[PDB]
Amino acid sequence: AQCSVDIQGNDQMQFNTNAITVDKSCKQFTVNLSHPGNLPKNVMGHDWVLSTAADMQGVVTDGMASGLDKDYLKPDDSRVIAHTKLIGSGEKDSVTFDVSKLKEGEQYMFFCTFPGHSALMKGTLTLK
Amino acid sequence: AQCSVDIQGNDQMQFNTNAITVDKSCKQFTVNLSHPGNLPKNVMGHDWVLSTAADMQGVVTDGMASGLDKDYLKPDDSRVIAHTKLIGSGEKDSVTFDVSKLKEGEQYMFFCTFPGHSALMKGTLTLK
Ligand SMILES: [Cu+2]
Ligand SMILES: [Cu+2]
């Protein structure tokens, strides 16, 4: 626990939280994602992606343009600090990243890149 | 216009009108739906479905459970007064229903039954 969190994205297009603070003593931080529900990945896919607030739009945009095969993310997009894979119902994925990639005083947002899902599936992350 | 309306569902999960009025003189009424943009049916499908405000949730829940192959609508759902098929970008569909299936003093709702979309895509229909 402490440097980790569990996120669930369901069939009603929602995440279970919209805010995450990362404790400044963490060297690394883990996100674990599971998709409750019965719908397939091609109709209700979810991933947890991270970037600063000012680049979220660019990532969602470039992400949509790359297709379901690239899990709706642009390959080697250097605005994406961290990201999971796109997962369907009953699947799960985890990502660990380096906390020194964040700095205190900058605003970060987590979100899903499936088309349209970022309207309700988005939230803040902050280094405290 | 005269006893019919032309409506659009776009790539942002938005319909372009959110209240429809049906005048009592009309024996029938027609709705013509188009979907501008470029996303396919499985990622951004849309339909126009009508029920009383009371049956919307029962219809939205059963439709999600019917699958993309059943155009996310329960077959022969007795609560649906009228509907179109589920279209992707570039496509189009229309429907004409009898105005005698509506009654004065009841509240009706139109919505898209694609999973996750009916929260953003809905509006009122009133018989005046
Ligand atoms: Cu999603
Ligand atoms: Cu829709």
From Swiss-Prot, chains A, B:
Chief localization: periplasm
Domain Plastocyanin-like as annotated: residue spans: 1-128
Subcellular location(s) of the protein: Periplasm
Domain of life per record: Bacteria
Keywords annotated in UniProt: Copper, Disulfide bond, Electron transport, Metal-binding, Periplasm, Signal, Transport
Coiled coil, from the record: none
CC annotations in GO: periplasmic space; plasma membrane
Keyword Translocase belongs to the record: no
InterPro entries: Azurin, BlueCu_1, BlueCu_1_BS, Cu-binding_ET, Cupredoxin
PROSITE patterns: COPPER_BLUE (PS00196)
Keyword Oxidoreductase: no
GO MF entries: copper ion binding; electron transfer activity; identical protein binding; transition metal ion binding; zinc ion binding
CDD domains the record matches: Azurin (cd13922)
A Pfam family recorded for this sequence: Copper-bind
Residues that coordinate or bind Cu cation: H46, C112, H117, M121
Entry-linked Gene3D superfamilies: Cupredoxins - blue copper proteins
Disulfide bonds: C3-C26
Function text: Transfers electrons from cytochrome c551 to cytochrome oxidase.
UniProt-recorded name of the protein: Azurin
Phylogenetic classification of the source organism: Bacteria, Pseudomonadati, Pseudomonadota, Gammaproteobacteria, Pseudomonadales
Gene designation: azu
